[model samples]
Target: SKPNVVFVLGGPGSGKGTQCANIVRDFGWVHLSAGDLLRQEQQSGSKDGEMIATMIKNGEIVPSIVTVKLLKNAIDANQGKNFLVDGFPRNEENNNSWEENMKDFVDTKFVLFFDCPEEVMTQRLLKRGESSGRSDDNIESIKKRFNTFNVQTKLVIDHYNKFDKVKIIPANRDVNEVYNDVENLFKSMGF
Candidate 1:
């Protein structure tokens, strides 16, 4: 059977990753973070490393084929039916590549979208930058990342919404409350 996939998408500091960790703890689904994967690939001296690093530093989306290959490899290597694929399909092109390439390997259950205000997200990211030690966590990069999310990533949400496969989570609230809603959502889906 094809693996069940949930695309978890949010702005740079929307706490989607935190909620994904909670769901994985409670729901037993594997969390396949696309950003983390790309970062790891970049750090592993792979041929795509330099390009991925450059794109990330500039807050640009990596090419769809490159991201798709990494995600497909992750899915193929992991042994699980449920996967929370975080921070992927950041644009229409990414979605198109997945439709053409990954459709046969997985069944997309829904797109879990986090809707948070830009100011709220920016503040959160600014705070994280103080200790994140990540190169792209600065104010300038955060703004660019938010812009990319709004201009490119949000379109993917609309694409999935057309299929009634997008679930919106208000992410500006307290972490526990946001995760409570997430827990309930997964519970309702029989996860």
Candidate 2:
């Protein structure tokens, strides 16, 4: 049983991963962080290693085909295992390309979008950056990623909205409160 796909998306620090953690524990999903998947590919030293490494280092987007392949393999190998595809379909381009390449695996294409104001997201990321000690995660880098998230990411969410396949979760609340809504969502959908 090839289970349904749920793509978790939001801005830099919108608690996507956090809520996904709750979902995995409470709902029995197999959470697959796309970044971890791609990083694994890079570590595997496949022919794509050099490119993936460079892109990741520069905060640039990895090609869609690479990510799609990883997702497909995960889904296939874990047949009947529901997936929490976190941090994926980065933009409209990624979405279209994935649909083209992963046509067979694309089912209902449900997308869970964490909706939060820019200020809230920025505050969260700024705090996260301070603690992580990643020099590159400074103001300039944050601005650049913010622009990408504002444009491409918003477009992807809106695009999903048109199809009535996107669920919106106001992510300005505390972790526990936000997760209450998230948990209710899948359950309401009859998970």
Candidate 3:
């Protein structure tokens, strides 16, 4: 059987990661975060490692082909596991590449999009940046990424919405509240 896959998307600091972590814990889905996969591949010394790192630090999207290939490998290696793929199909390029590359191999469930205000997300990111030590956690990088999300990622959501394949989770709430919404959605989906 094809592996089940959910594409999870959200603005920076919108708590997609937090809620996805809970979903994985309570629902037993594998969290194949695109950003994490890219970082791991970078650390493992691929030819695109330096470019990937540079783009991430500059709050730019890595090439869609590279990211799509990494995700294909991850899904293949995991075999029968269901997946909550966070921070993927980040732009039109990513969407097109995934369609070209992995659409046939997995059960593409739907897109889960976390919605939050920019101010709230900025505050959350600032707090996380205090301890994250990540290059893209700073204000400049955060702003750049926010623009990318609004311009590029929102279009991906719009594309899925046309197919009725997008689910919205309002995320400017308590962490438990956000997780509860996700859990409820999963339950309805037979999780």
Candidate 4:
């Protein structure tokens, strides 16, 4: 049988990463994080790594092509197990590239959206910046991230919503409460 797949989407600081880690702990599904994959590529010493590193260091978004390439590699590497792909399909370009590449490999099982208030996100990101050392974690960059998410990422959510596979998790609640909802969602998948 084909392995089940889940895509986790959220604005920056929405706790997608933390929640995904919890899911992995409870479900044993392989977690494939696009952010980590890109970071790995940027540190791989390949020619692509140089360009990716520079862009990442500047807090600039990597082009969709580069991001997709990394995701494809991850999929190729983990074909045997179920997967939870976090932080991908950030825009229409990403959605198109993913569809073009994976049209035959596997169909997406579901999309999870971590919905949180803007003020909450802002506070979380600022706290993250203090520890993350990311240049783009400043207030200006945070606002830019929010704007980009609102304008570009919403379409991706709508795309999945059209398929009736989108689950919006209210992230304003406590962490355990959010996880409870996520666990129930996964249980509904019977995997």
Candidate of highest lDDT:
3
For every model in order, what is the number of clashing pairs? 0, 0, 0, 0
* RMSD for each of the candidates: 1.1, 2.1, 0.9, 1.8
Candidate 1 structure quality by residue, lDDT tens digits, 158-182? 8789989999999999999999999
Model 3 has an lDDT value of 0.90
Q: How high is the CA lDDT of each candidate model?
A: 0.88, 0.81, 0.90, 0.84
Residue-level lDDT of model 4, residues 69-95, one tens digit each, is 877777778777888889888888888
Stretch of 10 with least lDDT, candidate 3: 71-80
Residue 136 error, candidate 1, Å:
0.9
**lDDT for predicted candidate 2 compared with the true structure:** 0.81
- Please write out the lDDT profile of model 2 over residues 1-191, one tens digit for every residue: 55777999988778888999999999898898887788888889899998987665555668888898898888778877788888888887788887887667646558998988888877787888878764335676666667777777788888888989898899999899999998899899888
Q: TM-score: which candidate is best?
A: 3
Ranking of all candidate structures by their lDDT, best first: 3, 1, 4, 2
Give the true-structure RMSD of model 3.
0.9
Clashes of 2: 0
Instruction: For model 3, state the Cα shift of residue 51 in Å.
Output: 0.5
TM-score of each: 0.96, 0.88, 0.97, 0.91
Off by over 4 Å in 4: 53-61
Clashing residue pairs, candidate 3?
Answer: none
